[PDB]
Write a protein that binds this ligand. Structure first.
Ligand code: W56
Ligand code: W56
Lengths: 273, 40, 255, 236, 273, 59, 59, 57, 40, 40
């Protein structure tokens, strides 16, 4: 492939460099339309800018935490982090979010990796070996209420059991209701005067629930869960302007008030170098 | 070799090697030729 | 003697002529078309009023003055009250449509000024409150009036800050969306053909707007000496290939 | 039972590896795809669309005005604007090009810089745009500027001028984050003759300026952007 | 292959052993040009002197250390070794360095092995199990500031998570900007009067960042990281004189003052055996 | 699931072993090679060039 | 001995995965099947039989 | 596979929607027996409702 | 590839792709045609 | 068998078995024959 062809002096009536940008086109002008060039080859394919590659590496999408401790006398397991959940979503942590929102609709399979590490902040004789049980709780399935409810039987709901310190990995097909996920939605769930605005009402997909299977030892053990997400088989439509201001909320486009100028001011003139 | 039955479980896809910027760079209704005048 | 410059669009029972055009943009290089069976889901036969809905509606005019910040209309909202297009809209459960948008602004060879005319698929607005305040329905359904970016923040309304496109992105990059400029010195109209763009084959026309049309002054209007300091901008829009499905009782929407 | 040996790296999680995994939802059938206009395949497809450069960066809070390069009637010989070419920083940084370049470590290729004139139709002007390849200072006067890559632009019916910064380089890749060894030059613009307004007209006229990449362009070695960060996880 | 051919008495006008070294050549003289030889075969190929073999074994290129401890009240994580980095480079440790600098330009893929072991120098009830997260931070990507910054999300930057006591291994393609890495560079980054001299300005490639993912236990744990590097697919040009004096700095050729004579003095005469 | 048995040596790191590894930079394209005079392939090539001997070591 | 590398997820138990296992009862012979009317293959077969709706829910 | 065929106005002596449930059958009535439909395809096989799948986790 | 000798040890079965609701939805002795009168 | 997609991930290269010391041992412009006089 040639990156530049050889081109010499020109004295024409045919001027490729004068255009009318009002038309909305970006005319494909090249170095050889306005200087004299020599042949050179590309030596490159643009492999690593493919959208599959761009969205295809694992990104941290969520960090939560649960603890193993005596539940005796706990009136609210959920509240003691005897187990916790995550009303699943991808726009919670921003590095990956800015990347996805370069597109309007996106379609992909997900590969999740879940790393779990334990901490024992206060005096323990040892490090126990805990098994985590992360379970998928889709919309309509009975959320669990205690850390050892009938729910955890999970007879119809996919669940994975792995050890703290290890990693669990599994992949979920594209579960969207439509043909693509929108990264974005200028609508409501119905014509209500006070209903919420945005994708929050679309991007409804359940929540994932974690717990330790082990009963309690004499000390307490903090287990912190990190969920990583990798898109595989990516398809993206309609590019948009990149995010400039900071994010404030999952699912709304809102930016913070009295934010700071995002364009760097010159130290000098327009004329400055 | 796929070891698994479902398609979601296969590895990453392989390069589009599609590439056609004209839907974005030249969505004009009447075709513009480089070198010919923009507005006639 | 054909110029890129003169054009005629006849759609239904209405025709537009421009003698100072700058080509026309067809979003993503695709022209509006009906919904193919292979893509269909709802089993209902759809209704295609054709020429009674696919004609040109001219919205009320705006006034560009030296202080203007820009205006924003949503589709199909802007047309919610135009003739039979609008009736069909409130009466069917689902509908689908593409449009021809023609924005008009003429001046003289002594004026200067340049407007950006852009179509943004799925333009989800931001609340000026920050945090996770929502933007109430009425605020994103201004109707033919559209939203005036130089109007004041209101409560439950969107933010109207132009350098941020009403969503946290910079004005400068709106050029990645199908768009055309109106530069008084060149141009006097902008025309964009919009194919139907959605993640579902057909949708509700009232709970979801699928494009915002935005006209934004970028190089300020500058009139000749002792000229009146303003120009009107007119927007005329025509639904094209419209289909309605799931007819019934007639939606009632807030406000 | 087949005898195996495990190597160093067993059990590691590399966020960039690409392997098979069991599906959690065996046998599930995804929604059919329908057609949607606009599919993107390569980021190289989109960085060829031009977007506006806030060249007039001299303000103090972001404003529509930093996109406008002003021009003065009747000045002769003088300089319209100047900038270095660190596409990952400074004026370029918020543009779509700048914004994507920042997802990669290295770039190579030609850039296309165009200027669209917005002055009254009955005015006229001749400007010179000059690209100064690495190795010399930003030009200080047109004489200096005109000895490097340049285009005399004659403002006419055809409203925009497209200047190309041809890839001039020893090393075949440069860093997107500004680096010396790897630096690309300067871009300046001067009156060639001068802007002239018709009667009954007055004041400043402005140029809009765009940037996009030539088909020439290469970007490689993906990394994280300095353009976005956060202090606590967001919630709904 | 014959190592020596058979050759007998000679009384010629053709003298292969008289040459003129001023020419710059090393004339290919053999035993059989000056004594009577018998046939012998080589029995050898020179396999283990191939440059791929010479540069192809893992060498320790870096030892760093980080600790897991309560960051509460630490004003400078980087400074507490709550995480550390390495402004990557290969000339830091000298065994491998002398080997590479036998050549001027070198091109190869790298295979890294990272061994991490833990130490608990002061009273602990136990040994905790820590997961390390080594992440690549290329030039221009936002360096991390705390041990748990948004940076560590590493949504676009390759990162590996492995356990202390284990090893991580991955391989990076040749990331040089030019066609080869120079082992050496008699230039500047620009014609500045005070800019630095040497390869230091060329060999700019980012830095690698390590941290423990675990929160803190009651005791403190020292984790010491050793990075090993193996060249694979080696290509080397222009041999040079081997390094004689000791090294003083990464990237400069400088040797220490009042160094010692590097040539061993005879214990005796020139005539001595 | 195929039955396996691991042998002695599993998990060891031998600095001299030669195996495959995942690339950290999937799909990256290295700079083209250009021609450079002087390529060395074997150390046996270079030890045939003669160099001076500090024979007079007595200093 | 063939060189291997284990990936993330090793040792996990996913209640939805489908693999082979050793039989605890090697060589056992199950009872022959006889014919029984009524075999169901898909839940989609049965949701097409209509059943009564307690529409008058007001009790 | 078609999920619905195209069907238009009807004015017949052949009424598929009147039945006698006392018989014990569930007559296979479709949308196209009582409204005007357009063609649409199934795009689906009913894989995940197989009893092997239902009892197999 | 089965690694084991017994049939119980193989993975899950594969979709019936049988599907015939008529034993449940139309177990009537004399065949009913849709469109013809239910009771003659 | 390569298990990985990228070339960097393959094992060590295989012996040049190239070997030609003359660029280093005899870079003279006019060819010298062993046995013939060095300087004529
Ligand atoms: C845009 C956009 C993209 C997404 C991601 C949606 C992910 C699909 C549902 O994800 C899961 C997650 C976890 C599990 C799970 N199953 C068990 C073994 C454990 O976790 C199942 C589905 O959300 N918005
Ligand atoms: C001469 C000469 C040769 C070299 C070596 C240059 C090495 C290339 C860059 O190396 C790395 C190192 C680490 C990682 C890394 N990625 C993550 C999984 C972890 O570490 C990536 C690239 O430097 N000078």
């Amino acid at each position: 492939t040639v990156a530049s062809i050889s081109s010499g002096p020109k004295h024409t009536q045919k001027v490729p460099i004068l255009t009318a940008n009002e038309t909305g086109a970006t005319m494909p002008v090249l170095p050889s339309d306005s200087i004299e060039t020599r042949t050179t080859y590309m030596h490159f394919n643009g492999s690593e800018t493919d959208v599959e590659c761009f969205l295809g590496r694992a990104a941290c999408v969520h960090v939560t935490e649960i603890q193993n401790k005596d539940a005796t006398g706990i009136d609210n397991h959920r509240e003691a982090k005897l187990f916790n959940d995550w009303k699943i979503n991808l726009s919670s942590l921003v590095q990956l979010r800015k990347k996805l929102e370069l597109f309007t609709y996106v379609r992909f399979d997900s590969e999740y990796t879940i790393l779990a590490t334990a901490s024992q902040p206060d005096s323990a004789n040892y490090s126990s070996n805990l098994v985590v049980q992360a379970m998928y709780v889709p919309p309509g399935a009975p959320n669990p209420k205690e850390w050892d409810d009938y729910t955890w039987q999970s007879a119809s709901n996919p669940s994975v059991f792995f050890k703290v310190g290890d990693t669990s990995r599994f992949s979920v097909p594209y579960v969207g209701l439509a043909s693509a996920y929108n990264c974005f939605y200028d609508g409501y769930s119905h014509d209500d005067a006070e209903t919420q605005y945005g994708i929050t009402v679309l991007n409804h997909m359940g929540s994932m629930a974690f717990r330790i299977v082990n009963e309690h030892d004499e000390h307490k053990t903090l287990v912190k869960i990190r969920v990583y997400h990798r898109a595989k088989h990516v398809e993206a439509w309609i590019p948009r302007a990149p995010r400039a201001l900071p994010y404030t909320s999952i699912g709304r486009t809102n930016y913070p008030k009295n934010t700071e100028p995002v364009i760097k001011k010159r130290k000098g003139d327009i004329k400055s170098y | 070799i796929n070891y698994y039955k479902d398609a979601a479980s296969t590895s990453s896809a392989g390069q589009s090697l599609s590439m056609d910027p004209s839907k974005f760079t030249e969505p004009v209704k009447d075709l513009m030729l480089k070198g010919a005048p923009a507005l006639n | 003697g054909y110029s890129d410059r003169v054009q005629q669009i006849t759609l239904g029972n209405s025709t537009i002529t421009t003698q100072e055009a700058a080509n026309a943009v067809v979003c993503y290089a695709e022209w509006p078309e009906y919904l193919p069976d292979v893509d269909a889901s709802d089993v209902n036969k759809t209704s295609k009023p054709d020429t009674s809905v696919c004609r040109f509606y001219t919205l009320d005019s705006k006034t560009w003055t030296t202080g203007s910040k820009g205006w924003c209309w949503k589709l199909p909202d802007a047309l919610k009250d135009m003739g039979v297009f609008g009736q069909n809209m409130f009466f069917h459960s689902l509908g689908r449509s593409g449009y021809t948008v023609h924005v008009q602004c003429n001046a003289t060879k002594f004026h200067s000024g340049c407007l950006l005319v852009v179509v943004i698929p799925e333009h989800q607005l931001a609340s000026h409150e920050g945090g996770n305040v929502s933007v109430k329905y009425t605020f994103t359904h201004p109707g033919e009036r559209g939203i005036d970016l130089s109007s004041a923040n209101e409560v439950g309304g969107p933010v109207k800050d132009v350098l941020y496109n009403m969503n946290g992105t910079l004005l400068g990059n709106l050029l990645i969306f199908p768009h055309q400029f109106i530069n008084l010195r060149t141009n006097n109209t902008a025309t964009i053909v919009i194919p139907y763009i959605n993640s579902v084959p057909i949708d509700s026309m009232t709970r979801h707007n699928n494009v915002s049309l935005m006209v934004i002054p970028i190089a300020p209007l500058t009139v000749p000496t002792g000229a009146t300091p303003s120009l009107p901008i007119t927007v005329t829009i025509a639904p094209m290939c419209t289909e309605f499905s799931g007819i019934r009782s007639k939606s009632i929407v807030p406000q | 039972g087949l005898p195996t040996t495990t190597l160093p790296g067993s059990g590691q999680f590399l966020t960039t590896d690409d392997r098979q995994s069991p599906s959690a939802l065996p046998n599930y059938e995804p929604t059919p795809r329908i057609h949607i206009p606009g599919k993107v395949h390569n980021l190289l497809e989109i960085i060829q669309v031009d977007t506006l450069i806030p060249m007039n960066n001299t303000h103090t809070k972001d404003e529509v005005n930093s996109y406008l390069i002003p021009l003065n009637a009747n000045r002769q010989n003088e300089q319209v604007f100047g900038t270095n070419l660190f596409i990952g920083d400074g004026v370029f940084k918020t543009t779509l090009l700048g914004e994507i370049v920042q997802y990669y470590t290295h770039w190579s290729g030609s850039l296309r810089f165009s200027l669209m004139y917005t002055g009254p139709a009955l005015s006229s002007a001749k400007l010179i745009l000059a690209y100064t390849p690495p190795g010399a200072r930003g030009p200080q006067d047109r004489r200096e500027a005109m000895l490097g890559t340049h285009v005399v632009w004659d403002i006419g019916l055809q409203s925009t001028i497209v200047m190309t910064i041809p890839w001039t380089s020893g090393v075949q890749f440069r860093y997107t984050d500004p680096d010396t060894y790897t630096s690309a030059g300067f871009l300046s613009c001067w009156y060639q003759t001068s802007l002239i307004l018709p009667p009954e007209t007055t004041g400043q006229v402005y140029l809009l300026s765009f940037i996009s990449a030539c088909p020439d362009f290469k970007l490689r070695l993906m990394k994280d952007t300095q353009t976005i960060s956060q202090t606590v996880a967001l919630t709904e």
